[PDB]
Amino acid sequence: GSAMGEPDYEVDEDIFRKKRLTIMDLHPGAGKTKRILPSIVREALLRRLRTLILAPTRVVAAEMEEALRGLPIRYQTPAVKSDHTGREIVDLMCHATFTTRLLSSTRVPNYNLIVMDEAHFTDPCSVAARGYISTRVEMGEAAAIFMTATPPGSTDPFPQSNSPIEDIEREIPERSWNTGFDWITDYQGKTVWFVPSIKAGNDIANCLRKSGKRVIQLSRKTFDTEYPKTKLTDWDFVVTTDISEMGANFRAGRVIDPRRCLKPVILTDGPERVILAGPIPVTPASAAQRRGRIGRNPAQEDDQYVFSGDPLKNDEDHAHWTEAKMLLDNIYTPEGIIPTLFGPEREKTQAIDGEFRLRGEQRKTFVELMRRGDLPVWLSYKVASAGISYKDREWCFTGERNNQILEENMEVEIWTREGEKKKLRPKWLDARVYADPMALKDFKEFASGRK
Ligand SMILES: [Cl-]
């Protein structure tokens, strides 16, 4: 005899039709959806469709490569601007790689099926990618599938799960604690703890570690190397920023979620600048994705989501919305049309389509500052639109006095490329380049002309 197992996934013809944007949920961990993406790709190739798969992270991309083994899959790095084979091939790349290629090449294929995994990702490049994809679909040039449990527009913090979740509302430490939270450390299972910042995570992680807990920390910059370690069993806590809202699959029994985040906001009273506001409450969708780390396994029925406070849905002042438009406005198309945001996300900005469009060398510098310089979209836009070349780092030193960067109450002083010692004092302030120690380290590297 045998077990039935997951049955063959017969694909809806509708999902391949041009002008169709399908939203679906893979419900990972159940686990009864292993055959879905493979089947979609198989049927796409049967129909001779030019197919693109977009993963949120390199990690997820690699897991896809394994899942799709035996199919003509080709991973695409952002180090290459285009890669055209004479052959039937499915391109696989990160959200950001797609947007980067659209900004940097005239040779981006006319994909007529586009699959975006974790399509809720609200990083500017992901938002822009959705805008471009939805525009191509509405043009009748493509069909697309957005895969996510929380499609843009969703406002449900407590959505369906594969397995019962116990939603527990109680006070959660925002920093190191001495007593009064025994439930945190008495818990015998594995916990994923969402924190608003790396700094906050450091404090929490250190406090857990001093009590004998084994802790893995995750952030955007460290996700690539550290996440793989969570696939082993030798940990008690994952302490992570919001990055783990995007496809991270933990074998854990508990989420701890104070429902806090930092939000980049462009201020406009005086010289435009980006601050990191908060901690403030997360959106319902974010809360849902944090909660959604657990309750994935029907055989494990006692998972917990421990949270504090209610979410806040209004995020219209998030810098990512403006930054999305800065990317979109600089993506061209042979039709001569500037791509607009995905429908549900249009209400997030009152920017006029095309207003951030740059021309010629300024556009190229814009892209280089983001790719090679690893600068935020907003900051890259300000520098590029000022007519500054990539290699010209004078602007890092010629800002007003109030723009002086501090570290430990000390005024930061660095070498220029030419070998002069100057105060770090950028013409444009973006908190995302100096707030976190590691971010400031990288920005100092940039200012000194070392990349
Ligand atoms: Cl992060």
Swiss-Prot record:
Subunit structure: Forms a heterodimer with NS2B. Interacts with NS4B. Interacts with unphosphorylated RNA-directed RNA polymerase NS5; this interaction stimulates RNA-directed RNA polymerase NS5 guanylyltransferase activity. Interacts with host SHFL.
Residues flagged as site, Involved in NS3 ATPase and RTPase activities: 290, 293
Chain segments carrying region Important for RNA-binding: 17-20
Domain Helicase ATP-binding: 13-169
Membrane topology of the entry: Peripheral membrane protein
Residues that hold ATP according to the record: 26-33
Chemical reaction(s) catalysed: Selective hydrolysis of -Xaa-Xaa-|-Yaa- bonds in which each of the Xaa can be either Arg or Lys and Yaa can be either Ser or Ala
Motif (DEAH box): 117-120
Modified residues (N6-acetyllysine): 221
UniProt-annotated location(s): Host endoplasmic reticulum membrane
Domain named Helicase C-terminal: residues: 179-346
Protein name listed in UniProt: Serine protease NS3
Portion of the full sequence shown: 1646 to 2092 of 3387
Chain's role: Displays three enzymatic activities: serine protease, NTPase and RNA helicase. NS3 serine protease, in association with NS2B, performs its autocleavage and cleaves the polyprotein at dibasic sites in the cytoplasm: C-prM, NS2A-NS2B, NS2B-NS3, NS3-NS4A, NS4A-2K and NS4B-NS5. NS3 RNA helicase binds RNA and unwinds dsRNA in the 3' to 5' direction.
Record topological domains on the Cytoplasmic side: 5-451
PTM (free text): Acetylated by host KAT5. Acetylation modulates NS3 RNA-binding and unwinding activities and plays an important positive role for viral replication.
